Paper text:
Cryo-EM analysis of automethylated [name] incubated with nucleosomes containing 40 bp stretches of linker DNA on both sides resolved two distinct species: nucleosomes bound by a single [name] complex and two [name] complexes interacting with one nucleosome and with each other in a non-symmetrical dimer. In contrast to other recently described symmetric [name] dimers, the two [name] complexes are arranged asymmetrically, with only one of them contacting the histone octamer in a way that is compatible with H3 methylation. We refer to this [name] as nucleosome-proximal [name] (PRC2prox) (blue). The second [name] is located distal from the histone core (referred to as PRC2dist) (orange) and interacts distinctly with each of the two DNA linkers, as well as with the PRC2prox. In the PRC2prox, the SET domain of [name] engages the substrate H3 tail while its CXC domain contacts the nucleosomal DNA, as previously seen. In addition to their interactions with the nucleosome, the PRC2dist and PRC2prox interact with each other via two different interfaces. The EZH2dist lacks density that would correspond to the bridge helix, indicating that the am-loop containing the automethylated K510, K514, and K515 is unfolded. The SET domain of EZH2dist is positioned close to EEDprox such that the automethylated lysines within the unfolded am-loop of EZH2dist can easily reach the allosteric methyl-lysine binding pocket of EEDprox. Our studies led us to discover a chromatin-dependent [name] dimer in which the automethylated am-loop of a PRC2dist binds the allosteric site in [name] of a PRC2prox that is engaged with the tail of the substrate nucleosome.
Numbering used by the authors:
A (entry chain W): 37 to 135
B (entry chain U), G (entry chain R): 12 to 119
C (entry chain V): 28 to 122
D (entry chain X): 16 to 102
E (entry chain A): 68 to 135
F (entry chain J): 20 to 102
H (entry chain S): 27 to 122
The structure:
């Protein structure tokens, strides 16, 4: 009996809000802690400037979010509102990134 | 003796002196023409004037007197002729254009 | 100390030429600074490549005119060309 | 420990709500549960391509710290460009 | 030949073409379409459809990014 | 059959052969009006770049060199013709 | 003295003699080091070797003895790194590698 | 008799004797290698110009070409390519 929303209603609110807002969506430290982990595989504990991590993030998120633009658009074409991995495999393959 | 910068000579607020120098320094050609940087200085000017107006056009739309990175994102993206010119670029804190597909909307 | 360069002043002069009432945030300016640096590297790029195939070692207004012909869509091209020739004619009057 | 750190569990920090929010900005209703691990791999794949190129600039200039200048250039090689960091 | 000569005549008249230059267009175009058709089929296979439909190409071009 | 829009010059079977090279099983009826459009626009941009190179050299003849260089701008670099 | 080429000096084949002069006009920097064309010339030797080695390998399978320009396509699109280097690269009279989708085949 | 042009004709033909002493190659196939090698030469050197520019230097020496081919060529291609160049410079500096 408590008031609810039909499934998906919270999403549409969370879509329009996140398109309106412009902040970075991943917490800084988990992203910061990961990027050093990848880098140390190549050399000896290179120091990252605080500007670099943000700049490395901005390109990634914009690249990553642009991927969902392609993935979701293909997903609609398959008459499914849901998203699936066999989409995300197909998304980049037309892009030529995987080629 | 009575000097005036080349930007003042064409009355164009772009580094007609400096742009002429950068062409020499970048090793783009053995010689650079007398009229050569002058032509390019306006080209940046008109290009930046058009992009800045649209950003300024966007700035009043959001009721804000200071253009933030977001207002750049709108100006580059909403007009496709700039958009295709900038199809390989992203803007820090630019965000994504406000849009949703019809199928994603509720069923009424 | 530490003398560096930018185009912050010049774009800022351009804004008041259009919308004097509004200001610019620090982050926004560097985008325009990088942007005008980006277009500069592009226009110089094909301009230099153009002179090479033509077996010419001098870059003049013509190559830039051809360069802007290629890089920008039609609507940007024809406006930029008109601005480009207008600027040179004012320059050539008292060069 | 005075120096050096252990490298583990770092991909786990890209938590499932974080994946949701990234998809949210793009705009979706339903996300399959299987996406969560795989798109992490895509982030791993994309990141390692650019950071490795970025390191090579740092190695070239003989420096031992990675900056925003190289990362701007490293993106430029891989067909992407970002503005707002003095490129 | 008749296609390329007429379309180029929109941009300027009195054009002549090196016979080697024309096949340069042909080989470039056939590579482009064949590349387009292969990826277009992938989307058709994704939709559980054996044949392709016109709506696949606009998706095929859109994902690549040069059209939309 | 008097002269018409020469985009009809590429024939109904000819496009089908092109699809076959691309691993296509079945071709819809409506695909043919689209393939003309995409082949039209792609071949539009190349020549426009190609013509301008000829304009710069003042030569009234489009050369193989120009077309190769027009392709490089779109990133569709081509081998086998020189330079 | 006696004239002997730098290619024999560095023990390779690609023209360190020509690369120097060509790179001088190439408009890449104010100066080019003495060792610049030698280090470069090996990379052309390395890249030409594998591409032709794979070109030679493909030819023996098709029983031909002249390298058809097709053979390059049938060799370049099999090495993923060489494919990656030429991913956006098309070659005249190239054809395509043979492949058919799994579903398109007959059910049995 | 005019316009003496530059091509890598003999060089690719002569180097091919390394892998197949007896196989020939088509005259049209001569042009693709002419176009391919010239293409890669542009991209490597074009990259080198920028790295010298980033550090604001006026000379192209072995190091930046070494990293240039380490960026452009993916995978293990560079590793032997570094090896090939490393041998190439040593022979030259030994006989300098």
């Amino acid at each position: 009996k408590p008031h609810r929303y039909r499934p998906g209603t919270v999403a549409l609110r969370e879509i329009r809000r996140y398109q309106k807002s412009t902040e970075l969506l991943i917490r800084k430290l988990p992203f910061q802690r990961l990027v050093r982990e990848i880098a140390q595989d190549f050399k000896t504990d290179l120091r990252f400037q605080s500007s670099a991590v943000m700049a490395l993030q901005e390109a990634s998120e914009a690249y990553l979010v642009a991927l969902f633009e392609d993935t979701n658009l293909c997903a609609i074409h398959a008459k499914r509102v849901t998203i699936m991995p066999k989409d995300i495999q197909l998304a980049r393959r037309i892009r030529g990134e995987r080629a | 003796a009575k000097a005036k910068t080349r930007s003042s000579r064409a009355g164009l607020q772009f580094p007609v002196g400096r742009v002429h120098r950068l062409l020499r320094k970048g090793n783009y050609a053995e010689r650079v023409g007398a009229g050569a940087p002058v032509y390019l200085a306006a080209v940046l000017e008109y290009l930046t004037a058009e992009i800045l107006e649209l950003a300024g056009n966007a700035a009043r739309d959001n009721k804000k007197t200071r253009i933030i990175p977001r207002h750049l994102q709108l100006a580059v993206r909403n007009d496709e002729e700039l958009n295709k010119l900038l199809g390989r670029v992203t803007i820090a804190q630019g965000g994504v254009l406000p849009n949703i597909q019809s199928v994603l909307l509720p069923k009424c | 100390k530490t003398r560096k360069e930018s185009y912050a002043i010049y774009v800022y002069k351009v804004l008041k030429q259009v919308h004097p009432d509004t200001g610019i945030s620090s982050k926004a300016m560097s985008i325009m600074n990088s942007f005008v640096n980006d277009v500069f590297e592009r226009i110089a790029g094909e301009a230099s490549r153009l002179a090479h195939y033509n077996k010419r070692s001098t870059i003049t207004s013509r190559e830039i005119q051809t360069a802007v012909r290629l890089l920008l869509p039609g609507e940007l091209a024809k406006h930029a060309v008109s601005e480009g020739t207008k600027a040179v004619t004012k320059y050539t009057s008292a060069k | 420990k005075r120096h050096r750190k252990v490298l583990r569990d770092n991909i786990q920090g890209i938590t499932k709500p974080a994946i949701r929010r990234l998809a949210r900005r793009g705009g979706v209703k339903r996300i399959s549960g299987l996406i969560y691990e795989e798109t992490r791999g895509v982030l791993k794949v994309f990141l390692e391509n650019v950071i490795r190129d970025a390191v090579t600039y740092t190695e070239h200039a003989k420096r031992k710290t990675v900056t925003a200048m190289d990362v701007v250039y490293a993106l430029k090689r891989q067909g992407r460009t970002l503005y707002g960091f003095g490129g």
